Design a protein around this ligand. Structure first.
Ligand SMILES: [Cl-]
Ligand SMILES: [Cl-]
Ligand SMILES: [Cl-]
Ligand SMILES: [Cl-]
Ligand SMILES: [Mn+2]
Ligand SMILES: [Mn+2]
Ligand SMILES: [Mn+2]
Ligand SMILES: [Mn+2]
Ligand SMILES: [Mn+2]
Ligand SMILES: [Mn+2]
Ligand SMILES: [Mn+2]
Ligand SMILES: [Mn+2]
Ligand SMILES: [Mn+2]
Ligand SMILES: [Mn+2]
Ligand SMILES: [Mn+2]
Ligand SMILES: [Mn+2]
Ligand SMILES: [Mn+2]
Lengths: 77, 92, 96, 105, 93, 107, 85, 99
DNA sequence: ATCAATATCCACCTGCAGATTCTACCAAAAGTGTATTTGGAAACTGCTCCATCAAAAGGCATGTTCAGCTGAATTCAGCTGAACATGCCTTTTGATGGAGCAGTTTCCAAATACACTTTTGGTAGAATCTGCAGGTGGATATTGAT
DNA sequence: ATCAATATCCACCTGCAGATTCTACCAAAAGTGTATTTGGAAACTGCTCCATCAAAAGGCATGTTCAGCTGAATTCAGCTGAACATGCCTTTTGATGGAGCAGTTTCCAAATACACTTTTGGTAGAATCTGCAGGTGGATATTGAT
């Protein structure tokens, strides 16, 4: 499912980041980087879900998971 | 059935500073996040200040020291002044 | 036939995507990835709609910021092309 | 007869801030001036951001502030940017900024 | 004046794992710092867990989740097993 | 009146359960503290302390020393992927750094 | 009172900066690094000391303690072990 | 008859190994103490310092600088240099979030 | 360094859907009045450490010479990545049920709080115990001129 | 490829600064009993999600062509490392007052507690009114030909 993150979507993110020219090997590298990040956040978000004895991951569970990883997110409280 | 937020107070401040400007629902949610974030930052630092000094009370002095620690530069000086002015007006 | 020179459209794309705010990854494939990853920690999970959006806002903000740092590293080496070694240097110095 | 907010000259809620301080396990006791001082600081910071962001909404012919305006307001101000340096504003995007060596010629 | 520290407990664990090894006072000061840091980390996260879930009690369940949040990988699983073992041993009087 | 049985001994622990309980009670973490919480916390702290002292005693034996010093703690922490991650933003006073010369600098 | 303290950032000598870089793995050092390093350190030290003295003043003390510095380092994300008790 | 001379970089490599093996503080104690007191005095006059507070500050500042010189070195090597330069420090501090 | 052609960007328009603002009702939160308690400031004062000076030798900073080797500057081809037309399939959008959790309220058994009392584990300082820091010298490895 | 120079490695040595053990007082943990609080099992009830199906739009995958960027190769002057003479100022240990933390006691200004009233903010639907989907026309920039 990580290949569902397509090369043009990765280019659009790089463009938002100001990048003009992109090596061909970047797309697989970005997928590996994204996967680690998503795994770390989701691992904690689910730990919060289990603690509340819920079966539904909430926006708050994600917000708390992002916060304790130093990446505070505004807009979903 | 009843969920609290800072939205009406953010709206009241917005109308003071820009009387005929509005705010979108999503932008309001960001403002709510912002107030809660700063509230926890200052209250958390004030709690540690009281504990470090073996006091059981959070006073305006702990809030002021927390503000000096947490806010950068000029923002701190204007926040300390606003805080001190509000306490004076309230005390009278 | 009309053909822009290599890099003219890239610069147009930078200007376009730095002025806008919409999400750049497609919804369904990201939604599918989140659930697959979530399965390896706990099975039978449901997700609030807004929780998937929070995760997507966070991952895209993270990837954009990382691509900005990666770009500085490429430019530091007298290049205009980002390469995996630029991402790796940037992630090493970020402490990741 | 008068809310504590109005006696302090504030829009932000003194009564509610005091209650949140009491129930957040910050300390066994909360003095009377602490919620007034805290409410005033929160009101001030909110005013500072809404001032700069209201500006952004008018420069693009909008009656309503949206997250992009908050993001431009925050990131174009050195102290606000530092205070919110580890904060993501959903739907805020980034500042327009192309490194010079990438421009043509 | 009376100053409390974790020094004697660190020393007893040291003697369990390395019966003929000692420790310098500066290294002991690093161990005390370490114990106090991790204590504040776990108790702080447990306090938020209880608050998020509107509980007024920090129970061993909050300690366990905080440990799962705060410790990486194998460390978490070994700490959870020791923690769970100590509580079961303790409740059986 | 019954014998006093240490809560540390009842849990099979070296770290002090009673003291941990008091520190939890007075740190304003919650209005109430359950009976198993200080037992679980003390056991985790004891476990992690054993993990660090195990590796640090090994490092001190690798340099033929009977006494652990901060350098051994630092070598122990930074040579272990998980301890290094847990203490990633921690400075160990007098710990120095790991030997490490980037390859492109060798002659 | 003591003789007035001035220009002490120059006490951070080029050989001490070199030794610091060596511990950091650095083999070769531009001539301009030494002045840059002093400015970076001055900013770092000022920031920590500012917060440390705020804790001191809040406690109504006239003596900066090790704990005041530990607390200042901690709230800047640079937890320091070894200086408690 | 020619006096012995090591090649440029051979003594530098010897020093890396020497200082990465040891743990002593690398800035002189008394000049560091004078620096701390000068900076603190400009924030509040008449301060005293516990001896261990000056030492805590020196431990923290030396670890910070060593860590920064590590990142600075990676940046110089990334540009195919073995010499660290101010633009390497500035890049490292920019990516670290200090700038 | 300019012209002619081409393509994209950027205001500006209407008309209308939908997001936001507006209004009124009402649990719940905030405020009030009055009583009562207490954390902690003020005023002491004992007693750690902190500031400062002192002495004196040698560890180390400084400033210089000189030359190795590095960074800087330049050229260039071959290979990669950008731009583009094309055509196909994944996503998007919409619809429809219904399965499944959150969420809510109530009520005791079980849990934790806390004043009082008893006991002992943990601390400070004294008395012992001992690594290892330096001090020395020889084997070996590395380095660099030859 | 082989010597001299030099550094680093590596055992060995002991006494004393620092670590460990001893000792006795006592603060805090534990025991007891009683008061108070809470988490959770039971029985629900709407409401978000998940599942399913469907068409079609528009975004992606692909293949082709070549521009221009990256990496390689090359040259060189001047920067920075290595080595050293010179001499200063850091280091170490101690003295000596005394600044200022701490420890203790007393006692209110400010805190909590509690019954009761007043007000407010959240909510939902109606009533407003802003963006925005596309379409247009001009601004502006890019590109190739000179
Ligand atoms: Cl107060
Ligand atoms: Cl690469
Ligand atoms: Cl429990
Ligand atoms: Cl430079
Ligand atoms: Mn063992
Ligand atoms: Mn009463
Ligand atoms: Mn009292
Ligand atoms: Mn000497
Ligand atoms: Mn000199
Ligand atoms: Mn070179
Ligand atoms: Mn070509
Ligand atoms: Mn005993
Ligand atoms: Mn030795
Ligand atoms: Mn007593
Ligand atoms: Mn005095
Ligand atoms: Mn109202
Ligand atoms: Mn449009």
């Amino acid at each position: 499912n990580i290949q569902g993150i397509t090369k043009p979507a990765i280019r659009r993110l790089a463009r938002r980041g100001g990048v003009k020219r992109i090596s061909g090997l970047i797309y697989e590298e970005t997928r590996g980087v994204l996967k680690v990040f998503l795994e770390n956040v989701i691992r904690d978000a689910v730990t919060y879900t289990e603690h509340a004895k819920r079966k539904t991951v909430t926006a708050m569970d994600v917000v708390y998971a992002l916060k304790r990883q130093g990446r505070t997110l505004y807009g979903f409280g | 059935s009843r969920k609290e937020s800072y939205s009406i107070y953010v709206y009241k401040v917005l109308k003071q500073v820009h009387p005929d400007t509005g705010i979108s629902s999503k932008a309001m949610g960001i403002m709510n996040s912002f107030v809660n974030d700063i509230f926890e930052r200052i209250a958390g630092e004030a709690s540690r200040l009281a504990h470090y000094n073996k006091r059981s009370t959070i006073t305006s002095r702990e809030i002021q020291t927390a503000v000096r620690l947490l806010l950068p530069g000029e923002l701190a000086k204007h926040a300390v002044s606003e805080g001190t002015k509000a306490v004076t007006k309230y005390t009278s | 036939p009309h053909r822009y020179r290599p890099g003219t459209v890239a610069l147009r794309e930078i200007r376009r995507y730095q002025k806008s705010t919409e999400l750049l990854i497609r919804k369904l494939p990201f939604q599918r990835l989140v659930r697959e990853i979530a399965q390896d920690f706990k099975t039978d999970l449901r997700f609030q709609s807004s929780a998937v959006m929070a995760l997507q806002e966070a991952c895209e903000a993270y990837l954009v910021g990382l691509f900005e740092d990666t770009n500085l590293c490429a430019i530091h080496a007298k290049r205009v092309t980002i390469m995996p070694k630029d991402i790796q240097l940037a992630r090493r110095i970020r402490g990741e | 007869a008068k809310s504590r907010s109005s006696r302090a000259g504030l829009q932000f809620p003194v009564g509610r801030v005091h209650r949140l301080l009491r129930k957040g396990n910050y300390a066994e006791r909360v003095g009377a001036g602490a919620p007034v001082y805290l409410a005033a600081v929160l009101e001030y910071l909110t005013a500072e951001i809404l001032e700069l962001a209201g500006n952004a909404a008018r420069d693009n012919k909008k009656t309503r502030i949206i997250p992009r305006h908050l993001q431009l307001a925050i990131r174009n101000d050195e102290e606000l940017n530092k205070l919110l340096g580890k904060v993501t504003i959903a739907q805020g995007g980034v500042l327009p900024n192309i490194q010079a060596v990438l421009l043509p010629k």
